[PDB]
């Protein structure tokens, strides 16, 4: 019987989260930049959206704008690189401050695996869990502005939440794959697209951790619903080298072009990071295997016409 707020409701993760919340009977206030815009139009079509979903024109940098939407909510899902940092941090601060004033039960903040593992002391041989934090200096040294900014934002979230005695929990997803609802999506899917359209006949010597978007959504809800949820939550399935991704696509989609070799055959295959998803498993989350993530991604690229 609850009302919840979802910020940036039209994004990749957020849309699937909205979908999930509507299926579980939640009443949803999705905040967007412009409600009557086409790129948001897929939300209004979701099962239950007619009855229980409203979209709201909200500017997160305007405190009163988010405040009026947050009042009445039991929960807030805040789902939302050098130039974006300060405004993102300011918008998050406003969400947290507004949540304190509205007396919501809990705020769920979408972060990233990038705030977890980017520290020189963090090897690819240790099992990395939620106790690991990235190194701001090391991120800065290496122009890793993604990891720097995510790390700053998440530290800011904790501090602002702590100042206001707001119950905040955080999800840290790895690379997110799966079916699309809108028509865009990340650099990995773009690489996968470039495999399957023949633009890329080689693959790089790199690894990556993947997770199904539906799992990410489910992780968000689990950490909102579970009274005992606390802290950070790594959201990952398993990691694959690029060559392993190619071999999977080859078994499922043998008719399509794929790269024929690694662009680096002189060095040994890079080993992946070992991330623990035990915290979410303990709350009872069962992860969709990565093979199925890749499958659903490609089907969606087909259905949406990005793939000839």
mmCIF file of C-alpha atoms in Angstrom:
data_model
loop_
_atom_site.group_PDB
_atom_site.id
_atom_site.type_symbol
_atom_site.label_atom_id
_atom_site.label_comp_id
_atom_site.label_asym_id
_atom_site.label_seq_id
_atom_site.Cartn_x
_atom_site.Cartn_y
_atom_site.Cartn_z
ATOM 1 C CA UNK A 1 0.000 0.000 0.000
ATOM 2 C CA UNK A 2 2.984 2.347 -0.290
ATOM 3 C CA UNK A 3 3.930 5.395 -2.296
ATOM 4 C CA UNK A 4 7.565 5.660 -3.431
ATOM 5 C CA UNK A 5 9.636 8.145 -5.401
ATOM 6 C CA UNK A 6 11.982 7.143 -8.248
ATOM 7 C CA UNK A 7 14.338 9.810 -9.596
ATOM 8 C CA UNK A 8 15.379 9.893 -13.260
ATOM 9 C CA UNK A 9 12.577 7.452 -13.911
ATOM 10 C CA UNK A 10 13.321 7.087 -17.621
ATOM 11 C CA UNK A 11 16.875 5.767 -17.358
ATOM 12 C CA UNK A 12 17.950 2.164 -17.900
ATOM 13 C CA UNK A 13 17.953 0.893 -14.294
ATOM 14 C CA UNK A 14 15.177 3.244 -13.131
ATOM 15 C CA UNK A 15 12.678 2.103 -15.765
ATOM 16 C CA UNK A 16 13.101 -1.519 -14.838
ATOM 17 C CA UNK A 17 12.790 -0.535 -11.192
ATOM 18 C CA UNK A 18 9.581 1.380 -11.922
ATOM 19 C CA UNK A 19 8.289 -1.704 -13.731
ATOM 20 C CA UNK A 20 9.087 -3.918 -10.757
ATOM 21 C CA UNK A 21 7.505 -1.508 -8.270
ATOM 22 C CA UNK A 22 4.310 -1.336 -10.333
ATOM 23 C CA UNK A 23 4.124 -5.151 -10.437
ATOM 24 C CA UNK A 24 4.408 -5.343 -6.651
ATOM 25 C CA UNK A 25 1.477 -2.933 -6.212
ATOM 26 C CA UNK A 26 3.465 0.180 -5.265
ATOM 27 C CA UNK A 27 2.180 3.592 -6.098
ATOM 28 C CA UNK A 28 5.012 5.382 -7.906
ATOM 29 C CA UNK A 29 6.091 8.983 -8.375
ATOM 30 C CA UNK A 30 8.690 8.999 -11.107
ATOM 31 C CA UNK A 31 10.599 12.259 -11.440
ATOM 32 C CA UNK A 32 11.808 13.351 -14.891
ATOM 33 C CA UNK A 33 13.143 16.452 -16.676
ATOM 34 C CA UNK A 34 10.124 16.636 -19.013
ATOM 35 C CA UNK A 35 7.144 14.253 -18.594
ATOM 36 C CA UNK A 36 5.524 14.894 -21.996
ATOM 37 C CA UNK A 37 8.699 13.876 -23.826
ATOM 38 C CA UNK A 38 8.817 10.750 -26.074
ATOM 39 C CA UNK A 39 11.875 9.194 -24.368
ATOM 40 C CA UNK A 40 9.746 8.816 -21.237
ATOM 41 C CA UNK A 41 6.726 7.452 -23.082
ATOM 42 C CA UNK A 42 7.516 3.802 -22.383
ATOM 43 C CA UNK A 43 6.845 4.253 -18.672
ATOM 44 C CA UNK A 44 3.167 5.171 -19.149
ATOM 45 C CA UNK A 45 2.726 1.873 -21.001
ATOM 46 C CA UNK A 46 3.885 -0.395 -18.166
ATOM 47 C CA UNK A 47 1.514 -2.819 -16.449
ATOM 48 C CA UNK A 48 -0.141 -0.864 -13.652
ATOM 49 C CA UNK A 49 1.158 2.507 -14.776
ATOM 50 C CA UNK A 50 -2.327 3.829 -15.606
ATOM 51 C CA UNK A 51 -3.574 3.074 -12.103
ATOM 52 C CA UNK A 52 -0.463 3.726 -9.976
ATOM 53 C CA UNK A 53 2.275 5.672 -11.807
ATOM 54 C CA UNK A 54 2.638 9.444 -12.050
ATOM 55 C CA UNK A 55 5.475 11.344 -13.708
ATOM 56 C CA UNK A 56 6.568 14.645 -12.281
ATOM 57 C CA UNK A 57 8.599 17.502 -13.696
ATOM 58 C CA UNK A 58 11.389 17.830 -11.154
ATOM 59 C CA UNK A 59 14.645 19.714 -11.065
ATOM 60 C CA UNK A 60 16.880 18.149 -8.436
ATOM 61 C CA UNK A 61 18.901 21.368 -8.094
ATOM 62 C CA UNK A 62 15.719 23.159 -6.953
ATOM 63 C CA UNK A 63 15.106 21.937 -3.381
ATOM 64 C CA UNK A 64 11.395 22.851 -3.343
ATOM 65 C CA UNK A 65 10.851 20.972 -6.584
ATOM 66 C CA UNK A 66 11.984 17.599 -5.236
ATOM 67 C CA UNK A 67 10.511 18.440 -1.794
ATOM 68 C CA UNK A 68 6.899 18.602 -3.029
ATOM 69 C CA UNK A 69 7.205 15.266 -4.760
ATOM 70 C CA UNK A 70 8.956 13.538 -1.840
ATOM 71 C CA UNK A 71 6.303 14.603 0.739
ATOM 72 C CA UNK A 72 3.966 11.676 1.299
ATOM 73 C CA UNK A 73 6.446 9.026 0.163
ATOM 74 C CA UNK A 74 7.535 6.102 2.321
ATOM 75 C CA UNK A 75 10.632 5.551 0.237
ATOM 76 C CA UNK A 76 12.895 7.245 -2.257
ATOM 77 C CA UNK A 77 14.955 5.542 -4.916
ATOM 78 C CA UNK A 78 17.608 8.000 -6.098
ATOM 79 C CA UNK A 79 18.980 6.402 -9.273
ATOM 80 C CA UNK A 80 20.839 9.457 -10.510
ATOM 81 C CA UNK A 81 32.250 12.845 -15.956
ATOM 82 C CA UNK A 82 34.381 15.769 -14.639
ATOM 83 C CA UNK A 83 31.674 18.422 -15.243
ATOM 84 C CA UNK A 84 28.701 16.438 -13.893
ATOM 85 C CA UNK A 85 30.220 15.896 -10.412
ATOM 86 C CA UNK A 86 29.231 19.099 -8.563
ATOM 87 C CA UNK A 87 25.640 19.242 -9.814
ATOM 88 C CA UNK A 88 25.110 15.490 -9.232
ATOM 89 C CA UNK A 89 26.344 15.940 -5.654
ATOM 90 C CA UNK A 90 24.138 18.989 -5.157
ATOM 91 C CA UNK A 91 21.073 17.134 -6.497
ATOM 92 C CA UNK A 92 21.732 14.130 -4.254
ATOM 93 C CA UNK A 93 22.077 16.465 -1.294
ATOM 94 C CA UNK A 94 18.659 17.911 -2.111
ATOM 95 C CA UNK A 95 17.101 14.465 -2.382
ATOM 96 C CA UNK A 96 18.484 13.469 1.011
ATOM 97 C CA UNK A 97 17.544 16.754 2.717
ATOM 98 C CA UNK A 98 14.042 16.523 1.202
ATOM 99 C CA UNK A 99 13.708 12.925 2.382
ATOM 100 C CA UNK A 100 14.605 13.926 5.962
ATOM 101 C CA UNK A 101 11.963 16.691 5.946
ATOM 102 C CA UNK A 102 9.313 14.410 4.420
ATOM 103 C CA UNK A 103 10.162 11.753 7.035
ATOM 104 C CA UNK A 104 10.507 8.910 4.514
ATOM 105 C CA UNK A 105 11.428 5.539 5.956
ATOM 106 C CA UNK A 106 14.412 4.904 3.683
ATOM 107 C CA UNK A 107 16.455 6.231 0.804
ATOM 108 C CA UNK A 108 18.028 3.817 -1.683
ATOM 109 C CA UNK A 109 20.931 5.371 -3.596
ATOM 110 C CA UNK A 110 22.210 3.901 -6.833
ATOM 111 C CA UNK A 111 25.981 3.982 -6.902
ATOM 112 C CA UNK A 112 28.503 1.826 -8.706
ATOM 113 C CA UNK A 113 31.166 -0.859 -8.410
ATOM 114 C CA UNK A 114 33.490 2.029 -9.320
ATOM 115 C CA UNK A 115 33.363 3.210 -5.711
ATOM 116 C CA UNK A 116 34.476 -0.140 -4.468
ATOM 117 C CA UNK A 117 37.544 -1.522 -6.191
ATOM 118 C CA UNK A 118 39.690 1.309 -7.624
ATOM 119 C CA UNK A 119 42.626 1.162 -5.189
ATOM 120 C CA UNK A 120 46.212 0.047 -6.086
ATOM 121 C CA UNK A 121 46.168 -2.201 -3.006
ATOM 122 C CA UNK A 122 43.157 -4.000 -4.446
ATOM 123 C CA UNK A 123 44.372 -6.992 -6.461
ATOM 124 C CA UNK A 124 42.545 -9.206 -8.949
ATOM 125 C CA UNK A 125 43.382 -12.123 -6.623
ATOM 126 C CA UNK A 126 41.508 -11.054 -3.497
ATOM 127 C CA UNK A 127 37.739 -11.433 -2.983
ATOM 128 C CA UNK A 128 36.449 -7.846 -2.940
ATOM 129 C CA UNK A 129 33.435 -7.038 -0.761
ATOM 130 C CA UNK A 130 31.569 -3.998 0.536
ATOM 131 C CA UNK A 131 34.401 -3.099 2.925
ATOM 132 C CA UNK A 132 36.599 -1.977 0.025
ATOM 133 C CA UNK A 133 36.639 1.637 -1.112
ATOM 134 C CA UNK A 134 38.245 3.216 -4.149
ATOM 135 C CA UNK A 135 41.188 5.615 -3.744
ATOM 136 C CA UNK A 136 40.286 9.188 -4.700
ATOM 137 C CA UNK A 137 43.944 10.069 -5.288
ATOM 138 C CA UNK A 138 44.568 7.024 -7.452
ATOM 139 C CA UNK A 139 41.438 7.700 -9.496
ATOM 140 C CA UNK A 140 42.591 11.282 -9.873
ATOM 141 C CA UNK A 141 46.159 10.260 -10.793
ATOM 142 C CA UNK A 142 44.836 8.088 -13.622
ATOM 143 C CA UNK A 143 42.183 10.437 -15.069
ATOM 144 C CA UNK A 144 39.588 7.842 -14.050
ATOM 145 C CA UNK A 145 36.962 10.552 -13.655
ATOM 146 C CA UNK A 146 34.090 8.051 -13.614
ATOM 147 C CA UNK A 147 35.395 6.249 -10.542
ATOM 148 C CA UNK A 148 36.476 9.479 -8.868
ATOM 149 C CA UNK A 149 33.090 11.116 -9.288
ATOM 150 C CA UNK A 150 31.050 8.080 -8.284
ATOM 151 C CA UNK A 151 33.244 7.729 -5.198
ATOM 152 C CA UNK A 152 32.851 11.397 -4.253
ATOM 153 C CA UNK A 153 29.069 11.287 -4.831
ATOM 154 C CA UNK A 154 28.604 8.163 -2.709
ATOM 155 C CA UNK A 155 30.750 9.521 0.137
ATOM 156 C CA UNK A 156 28.735 12.725 -0.055
ATOM 157 C CA UNK A 157 25.494 10.701 0.132
ATOM 158 C CA UNK A 158 26.606 8.870 3.299
ATOM 159 C CA UNK A 159 27.716 12.101 4.992
ATOM 160 C CA UNK A 160 24.573 14.033 4.140
ATOM 161 C CA UNK A 161 22.432 11.052 5.207
ATOM 162 C CA UNK A 162 24.335 10.796 8.482
ATOM 163 C CA UNK A 163 24.006 14.526 9.168
ATOM 164 C CA UNK A 164 20.224 14.266 8.740
ATOM 165 C CA UNK A 165 19.752 10.873 10.427
ATOM 166 C CA UNK A 166 18.237 9.521 7.220
ATOM 167 C CA UNK A 167 18.227 5.755 6.685
ATOM 168 C CA UNK A 168 20.265 5.393 3.485
ATOM 169 C CA UNK A 169 21.269 2.183 1.725
ATOM 170 C CA UNK A 170 23.363 1.880 -1.429
ATOM 171 C CA UNK A 171 23.462 -0.509 -4.371
ATOM 172 C CA UNK A 172 26.740 -0.846 -6.297
ATOM 173 C CA UNK A 173 26.127 -2.465 -9.682
ATOM 174 C CA UNK A 174 28.784 -3.633 -12.104
ATOM 175 C CA UNK A 175 28.106 -3.313 -15.863
ATOM 176 C CA UNK A 176 24.371 -3.652 -16.400
ATOM 177 C CA UNK A 177 22.975 -5.632 -19.339
ATOM 178 C CA UNK A 178 19.568 -6.827 -20.452
ATOM 179 C CA UNK A 179 16.498 -5.970 -22.511
ATOM 180 C CA UNK A 180 15.854 -2.331 -23.317
ATOM 181 C CA UNK A 181 12.631 -0.440 -22.615
ATOM 182 C CA UNK A 182 13.948 2.861 -24.010
ATOM 183 C CA UNK A 183 16.284 2.965 -27.037
ATOM 184 C CA UNK A 184 19.821 3.831 -25.832
ATOM 185 C CA UNK A 185 22.244 2.051 -23.420
ATOM 186 C CA UNK A 186 25.897 1.788 -22.452
ATOM 187 C CA UNK A 187 29.366 1.395 -23.927
ATOM 188 C CA UNK A 188 29.455 -2.364 -23.309
ATOM 189 C CA UNK A 189 26.229 -2.974 -25.224
ATOM 190 C CA UNK A 190 27.665 -0.693 -27.871
ATOM 191 C CA UNK A 191 30.742 -2.911 -28.028
ATOM 192 C CA UNK A 192 28.466 -5.972 -28.228
ATOM 193 C CA UNK A 193 26.599 -4.212 -31.017
ATOM 194 C CA UNK A 194 29.878 -3.530 -32.797
ATOM 195 C CA UNK A 195 30.748 -7.203 -32.576
ATOM 196 C CA UNK A 196 27.413 -8.263 -34.044
ATOM 197 C CA UNK A 197 27.248 -5.693 -36.821
ATOM 198 C CA UNK A 198 30.753 -6.466 -38.064
ATOM 199 C CA UNK A 199 32.304 -3.096 -37.177
ATOM 200 C CA UNK A 200 34.715 -4.782 -34.780
ATOM 201 C CA UNK A 201 36.669 -7.838 -36.023
ATOM 202 C CA UNK A 202 38.869 -7.904 -32.921
ATOM 203 C CA UNK A 203 38.234 -7.906 -29.202
ATOM 204 C CA UNK A 204 40.439 -6.306 -26.548
ATOM 205 C CA UNK A 205 42.332 -8.038 -23.759
ATOM 206 C CA UNK A 206 40.043 -6.958 -20.920
ATOM 207 C CA UNK A 207 37.529 -8.389 -18.485
ATOM 208 C CA UNK A 208 34.307 -7.051 -17.044
ATOM 209 C CA UNK A 209 31.716 -7.968 -14.435
ATOM 210 C CA UNK A 210 28.105 -8.128 -15.657
ATOM 211 C CA UNK A 211 24.660 -8.198 -14.027
ATOM 212 C CA UNK A 212 21.116 -8.431 -15.358
ATOM 213 C CA UNK A 213 19.167 -5.166 -15.111
ATOM 214 C CA UNK A 214 16.235 -7.051 -13.588
ATOM 215 C CA UNK A 215 18.509 -8.237 -10.770
ATOM 216 C CA UNK A 216 19.648 -4.648 -10.159
ATOM 217 C CA UNK A 217 16.037 -3.541 -9.824
ATOM 218 C CA UNK A 218 15.277 -6.457 -7.553
ATOM 219 C CA UNK A 219 18.319 -5.629 -5.457
ATOM 220 C CA UNK A 220 16.989 -2.062 -5.082
ATOM 221 C CA UNK A 221 13.623 -3.245 -3.847
ATOM 222 C CA UNK A 222 15.072 -5.901 -1.565
ATOM 223 C CA UNK A 223 17.205 -3.321 0.250
ATOM 224 C CA UNK A 224 14.223 -1.031 0.587
ATOM 225 C CA UNK A 225 11.806 -3.737 1.852
ATOM 226 C CA UNK A 226 14.183 -5.565 4.180
ATOM 227 C CA UNK A 227 14.040 -3.728 7.495
ATOM 228 C CA UNK A 228 17.496 -5.037 8.424
ATOM 229 C CA UNK A 229 19.231 -3.848 5.225
ATOM 230 C CA UNK A 230 22.193 -1.609 5.997
ATOM 231 C CA UNK A 231 25.256 -0.273 4.180
ATOM 232 C CA UNK A 232 26.493 -0.948 0.648
ATOM 233 C CA UNK A 233 25.430 -3.759 -1.689
ATOM 234 C CA UNK A 234 27.531 -5.119 -4.524
ATOM 235 C CA UNK A 235 25.298 -6.160 -7.384
ATOM 236 C CA UNK A 236 27.189 -8.503 -9.688
ATOM 237 C CA UNK A 237 26.763 -11.941 -11.242
ATOM 238 C CA UNK A 238 30.106 -13.066 -12.690
ATOM 239 C CA UNK A 239 32.931 -11.618 -14.752
ATOM 240 C CA UNK A 240 33.878 -12.453 -18.320
ATOM 241 C CA UNK A 241 36.832 -11.689 -20.522
ATOM 242 C CA UNK A 242 35.860 -10.133 -23.885
ATOM 243 C CA UNK A 243 36.876 -13.377 -25.629
ATOM 244 C CA UNK A 244 34.443 -15.227 -23.342
ATOM 245 C CA UNK A 245 31.648 -12.849 -24.360
ATOM 246 C CA UNK A 246 32.469 -13.564 -28.007
ATOM 247 C CA UNK A 247 32.357 -17.344 -27.417
ATOM 248 C CA UNK A 248 28.945 -17.047 -25.775
ATOM 249 C CA UNK A 249 27.565 -14.985 -28.661
ATOM 250 C CA UNK A 250 29.025 -17.547 -31.052
ATOM 251 C CA UNK A 251 27.051 -20.398 -29.451
ATOM 252 C CA UNK A 252 23.781 -18.455 -29.293
ATOM 253 C CA UNK A 253 24.104 -16.455 -32.483
ATOM 254 C CA UNK A 254 26.306 -18.411 -34.937
ATOM 255 C CA UNK A 255 24.751 -16.623 -37.960
ATOM 256 C CA UNK A 256 26.123 -13.202 -36.948
ATOM 257 C CA UNK A 257 29.577 -11.717 -37.554
ATOM 258 C CA UNK A 258 31.852 -11.589 -34.511
ATOM 259 C CA UNK A 259 35.467 -10.654 -33.941
ATOM 260 C CA UNK A 260 37.887 -13.364 -35.110
ATOM 261 C CA UNK A 261 40.729 -12.753 -32.622
ATOM 262 C CA UNK A 262 42.124 -10.703 -29.708
ATOM 263 C CA UNK A 263 43.848 -7.476 -30.761
ATOM 264 C CA UNK A 264 46.542 -8.396 -28.242
ATOM 265 C CA UNK A 265 47.996 -11.877 -28.753
ATOM 266 C CA UNK A 266 51.425 -11.182 -27.270
ATOM 267 C CA UNK A 267 50.280 -10.676 -23.657
ATOM 268 C CA UNK A 268 48.492 -13.175 -21.366
ATOM 269 C CA UNK A 269 44.709 -12.907 -20.875
ATOM 270 C CA UNK A 270 43.862 -10.356 -18.202
ATOM 271 C CA UNK A 271 42.206 -11.926 -15.157
ATOM 272 C CA UNK A 272 38.954 -10.507 -13.791
ATOM 273 C CA UNK A 273 38.311 -8.945 -10.415
ATOM 274 C CA UNK A 274 36.646 -11.205 -7.835
ATOM 275 C CA UNK A 275 33.581 -9.432 -6.429
ATOM 276 C CA UNK A 276 31.368 -10.845 -3.670
ATOM 277 C CA UNK A 277 27.604 -10.672 -4.119
ATOM 278 C CA UNK A 278 27.076 -12.581 -0.876
ATOM 279 C CA UNK A 279 25.339 -9.663 0.838
ATOM 280 C CA UNK A 280 22.461 -9.630 -1.688
ATOM 281 C CA UNK A 281 22.394 -13.454 -1.819
ATOM 282 C CA UNK A 282 21.886 -13.446 1.955
ATOM 283 C CA UNK A 283 18.820 -11.219 1.478
ATOM 284 C CA UNK A 284 17.644 -13.923 -0.907
ATOM 285 C CA UNK A 285 18.509 -12.530 -4.323
ATOM 286 C CA UNK A 286 19.061 -15.165 -6.991
ATOM 287 C CA UNK A 287 21.092 -13.860 -9.905
ATOM 288 C CA UNK A 288 20.378 -14.453 -13.570
ATOM 289 C CA UNK A 289 23.525 -16.094 -15.046
ATOM 290 C CA UNK A 290 25.550 -13.867 -17.387
ATOM 291 C CA UNK A 291 24.871 -16.049 -20.456
ATOM 292 C CA UNK A 292 21.201 -15.144 -20.144
ATOM 293 C CA UNK A 293 22.108 -11.450 -19.743
ATOM 294 C CA UNK A 294 23.936 -11.499 -23.059
ATOM 295 C CA UNK A 295 21.091 -13.413 -24.702
ATOM 296 C CA UNK A 296 18.404 -10.921 -23.604
ATOM 297 C CA UNK A 297 20.590 -7.997 -24.597
ATOM 298 C CA UNK A 298 21.024 -9.253 -28.144
ATOM 299 C CA UNK A 299 17.324 -10.144 -28.569
ATOM 300 C CA UNK A 300 16.437 -6.636 -27.497
ATOM 301 C CA UNK A 301 18.918 -5.130 -29.983
ATOM 302 C CA UNK A 302 17.142 -7.219 -32.639
ATOM 303 C CA UNK A 303 13.573 -6.389 -31.594
ATOM 304 C CA UNK A 304 14.383 -2.674 -31.315
ATOM 305 C CA UNK A 305 16.051 -2.685 -34.737
ATOM 306 C CA UNK A 306 19.614 -1.772 -33.768
ATOM 307 C CA UNK A 307 20.731 -5.068 -35.221
ATOM 308 C CA UNK A 308 20.372 -5.800 -38.974
#
